[PDB]
Swiss-Prot record, chain A:
It is found in: Nucleus. Belongs to the RRS1 family. It comes from the Eukaryota. Involved in ribosomal large subunit assembly. This is Ribosome biogenesis regulatory protein homolog.
Length: 97, 214, 62
RNA sequence: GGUUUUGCGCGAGUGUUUGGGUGUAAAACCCGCACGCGUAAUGAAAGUGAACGUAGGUGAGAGCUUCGGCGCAUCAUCGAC
RNA sequence: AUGGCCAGAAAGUGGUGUUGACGCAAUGUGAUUUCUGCCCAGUGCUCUGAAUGUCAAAGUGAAGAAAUUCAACCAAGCGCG
RNA sequence: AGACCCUGUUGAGCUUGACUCUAGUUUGACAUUGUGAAAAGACAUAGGAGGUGUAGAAUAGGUGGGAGCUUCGGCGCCAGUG
RNA sequence: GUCCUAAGGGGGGCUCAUGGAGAACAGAAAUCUCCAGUAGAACAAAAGGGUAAAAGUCCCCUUGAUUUUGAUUUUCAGUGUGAAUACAAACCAUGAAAGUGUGGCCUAUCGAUCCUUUAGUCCCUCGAAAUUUGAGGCUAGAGGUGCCAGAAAAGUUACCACA
């Protein structure tokens, strides 16, 4: 039993329903159905639209060479790296068990 | 530890080894050390090599591992040698390496060949405690042989008892004093707290009763 | 003994340190019991000083 | 007890009035050692301690000028300690 | 009874008590009639039965030049049974 | 200027393995604390005797010297296993 | 920092790396043609026997991004038309067909101006002086919630009160 599974069993956290965990959501502003993640997911919104406004302080603190069109991919890679770090720790502990 | 007591012990050791009882072979003077206030089972095991002022071991053999120029230098120096092609014909043979380590008591290898020792002979010599001493192409081979002969080690094993061949009866009293004092000072310098970690010191010959210093 | 504090009770029961808890858990109350009894207490909106609803009640989401 | 502004005295100094002298006596007048702030900063501290130059160069800049320029305050900028 | 239940800041202090189980104190239920759904053993009540498992202060030993550090031993309760 | 409802850096009474304390109670230690006997445990010695997981004379404390010891029977390096 | 009607699945066609001989620029190295080429290429894994009219590579179709049912398996459910899960069946995709295949993978969270830790020899001070431990300061490193510490301050008032 993994760390999340043990924590959820201790805290009474129910597994999500298959309708709740679908990769689908309704965007009101466009009036369209879009995906939460994946190809053209909602987590990468505005990475390909023609105009993004940027903060002056954010551009001042931004390192040279980096653009605003990769910030969401950077955040996604950070979350994905943390996810496999946790997954590999769980796999190693299960292998020791 | 003072002067005159150890001098008297050395004089009595020489008197017993020369006049009271003399064997048919040259005896070897050894120092045996017990250690207190320290335990190797929970701290780091130290190591160290020191060059004694006089060659303590006269009856030992040295194996030289090198190329043809090293073999030529060895035959000029009067020391046996064996080559890298013989290393490949050995090829990590455990029985042959065991027999070589039991026969030869010291090893010297060149700097252009010491990189191949773990590849061809493995960790057998390091396990046996006779890992070869590196020698460069410009170093004097006779001087390196003398340094290896006079060099003794104080590596800390898993037990408290330690032994170092500090000299021989064929030396003189002053040279035996020099060897014993340098060995004791090097052991004290290796120890973290000096004389506080020294448990007991004992000097004897090969066929002689012991004498206690500490 | 060990102590009648809640920290001592958790250490005696062998709970995982750093776990979240619901406000009101004690020796007699588990999380499920606390939620069940707080159902009976819920039903009142959050208001400001002039009686305007700033947060609606449960299932009254506006 | 701070801070900004106005007036006043003195000015690299300034502040007599804790105290002393004196008095027509809680007034007024006089006296000076110490001390406070300012005159040097920086560093956790040990400590060290502010001119290359008519106290620098460039562009402005009121006023003055022998009508060639000299250039206050102040600003921007490059230098020096 | 070198007791229980109380009280007092304490006392060579007080009460119960001029008391002694057919008594004193604390509870629950509440005349009479009726009356104990059946069986346990999870929480609890109590067993000085073995353990050191947890194990405070004081005390003991070792290292060091000492401050100090490291070790056992470790009451009751908890834990186990 | 009641009652009802709403708000509070709200006040206060009450409850409970809420937090921090505490009266009472219980346990240990030092002192008060004197005069005598007898046991038990732990450390130290003066030491004595041992020690196989496999392979391997040996039931391998280990470490360092060592090819010689020799008290004349032989014991040994060397051979073999680790 | 740019690119994509996503991957996957089914069917069909083809054979790779390399070597030799040939072709204006083209000359070791550009592309084309033939021959020889057990895979020496590619794709997955870590053969001591993976795959050749394919598991390689390009075309055609789907791309619908996680279907429905279940008296059954396991876990849960103060929101019990049950949910999640396993299995089965149906459906679906492709193909002429035999068939083949899909209907996910994971994970507590919180600090980084934080936590833990290391070094200074020729760094400073411990203010009566010196040395050795020790301590503080300053500076410079290492790692990242398995071995980086920790993250338990509740209620009620129909006995009431005030602004």
């Amino acid at each position: 039993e993994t760390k999340w599974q043990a924590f959820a069993r201790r805290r009474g956290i129910k597994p999500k329903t298959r309708e709740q965990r679908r990769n689908l959501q309704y965007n009101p502003t466009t009036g369209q159905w879009e995906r939460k993640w994946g190809y053209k997911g909602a987590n990468k919104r505005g990475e390909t639209d023609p105009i993004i406004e940027v903060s002056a302080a954010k551009e001042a603190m931004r390192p040279e060479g980096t653009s605003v069109r990769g910030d969401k991919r950077r955040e996604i890679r950070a979350r994905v790296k943390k996810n496999q770090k946790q997954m590999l720790r769980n796999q190693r502990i299960a292998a020791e068990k | 530890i003072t002067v005159a007591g150890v001098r008297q012990n050395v004089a009595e050791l020489l008197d017993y080894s020369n006049n009271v009882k003399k064997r048919n072979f040259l005896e070897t003077v050894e120092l045996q050390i017990g250690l207190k206030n320290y335990d190797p089972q929970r701290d780091k095991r130290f190591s160290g090599t020191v060059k004694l002022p006089t060659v303590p071991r006269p009856n030992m053999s040295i194996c030289i591992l090198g190329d043809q120029h090293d073999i030529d230098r060895a035959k000029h120096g009067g020391i046996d040698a064996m080559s890298a092609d013989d290393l490949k014909k050995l090829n990590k043979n455990k029985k042959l390496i065991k027999k070589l380590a039991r026969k030869y008591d010291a090893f010297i290898a060149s700097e252009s060949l010491i990189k191949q020792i773990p590849r061809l002979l493995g960790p057998g010599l390091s396990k046996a405690g006779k890992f070869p001493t590196p020698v460069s192409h410009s170093d004097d081979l006779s001087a390196k042989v003398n340094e290896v002969k006079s060099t003794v080690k104080f590596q800390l094993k898993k037990v408290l008892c330690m032994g170092v061949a500090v000299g021989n009866v064929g030396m003189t009293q002053e040279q035996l004093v020099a060897n014993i004092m340098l060995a004791i000072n090097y052991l004290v310098s290796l120890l973290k707290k000096g004389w506080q970690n020294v448990g007991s010191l004992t000097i004897k010959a090969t066929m002689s009763p012991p004498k206690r210093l500490y | 003994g060990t102590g009648k504090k809640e920290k001592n009770r958790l250490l005696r029961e062998g709970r995982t340190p750093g776990d979240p808890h619901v406000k009101g858990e004690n020796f007699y109350r588990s999380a499920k019991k606390i939620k069940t009894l707080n159902i009976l207490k819920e039903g009142k909106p959050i208001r400001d000083s002039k009686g305007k609803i700033v947060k609606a009640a449960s299932f009254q989401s506006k």
